[PDB]
Amino acid sequence: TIPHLAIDPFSLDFFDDPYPDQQTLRDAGPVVYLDKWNVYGVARYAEVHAVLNDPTTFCSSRGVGLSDFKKEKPWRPPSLILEADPPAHTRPRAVLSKVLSPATMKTIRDGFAAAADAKVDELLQRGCIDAIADLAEAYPLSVFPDAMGLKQEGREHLLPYAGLVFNAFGPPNELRQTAIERSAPHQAYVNEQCQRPNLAPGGFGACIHAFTDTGEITPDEAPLLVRSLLSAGLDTTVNGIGAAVYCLARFPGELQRLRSDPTLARNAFEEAVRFESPVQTFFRTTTREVELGGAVIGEGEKVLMFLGSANRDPRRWSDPDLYDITRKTSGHVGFGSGVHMCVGQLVARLEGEVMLSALARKVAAIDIDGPVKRRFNNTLRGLESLPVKLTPA
């Protein structure tokens, strides 16, 4: 019954061309058994969406990577939000939700939009740019660290620190073991910046620490919640903006549609998150025996969810392999779904929308011109280099 697959969804060969293996994942059955990591997988939209939306049965407090925190020591002290279940999750979730609320976004949106317009104007002076280094990375680096209230020095650690955190969800392969062996200087940098004296007034970090004054969180919790924004808040949006530029470069007809109606910017960014799914996978662990995909899975079992595959599952999406900036994207799982659904999603959408808006208004063509190089990571999907030529409007 439950079919076996030898597919290693954490291997270099899979990252370099995942779609034929994702389709085998889906077609083999609603639940698969991965022999490479002795773990159950669900790759269809129906199972992934159901598991995200039953956190009681499929918990996050035993870890959302392969490692079971009941059985093995976590590689770092657990996140208070990502690796917690309700009710322990609920208070820190409510705190970060207020820190990153629609009201907060309104207060920072003009400066984010101005930085994205200035960036696109500067890139158009050079013409030949790397859409990763000069855009997908440079743009969030120019707005997010400042929005957090970080000091200038040490910011070069932010991307490798996120790369470590996202590799650490994976199985114990070489990407994970190498990242953990090199982790100490990145972790020392982030640990210092999570402290209250180091976070400038008015930014997200100081706003988090302001909740210690009323007692909503303790002095020990506050630096761990700042740590969640420094683990997830930059490299995700780097890879989301990168996906969107890549999609627009490969689908020239969709770029023209966006130029013809720039109000499509926010949806063209949502559709890039669905299409590429920058965060490809998370796990859950069962807290009871449960029927999943017609099979009775025992209590205590890891289940790997393939969010990228759910987002491309033809049982749910029409022409899922096409980038379509007017697709109805509501329901995609690129930001997760339910109680843990991305608490930073308004920040990611803000950055995505204002950058795509600047591109829609200022650029007439995006042509790939030189070797595209993939970056490999156990959880994040994206490119290391995307050289392009931008033609001004």
Ligand code: HEM
């Ligand atoms: C395109 C960009 C992004 C993508 C694709 C993404 C993806 C995800 C996904 C799939 C989850 C669900 C985790 C789960 O169910 O276990 C999540 C949660 C989370 N995200 Fe995002 N994210 C992005 C941007 C951001 C940003 C900008 C921030 C912060 C400023 C952020 C902070 C977090 C945090 C702290 C959680 C844990 C929420 C919880 O457990 O309740 N993310 N995100």
Ligand SMILES: COc1ccc(C(=O)O)cc1
């Ligand atoms: C979506 O990826 C992450 C990674 C880490 C954290 C965290 O450290 O809380 C949250 C979400």
Ligand SMILES: [Cl-]
């Ligand atoms: Cl850490």
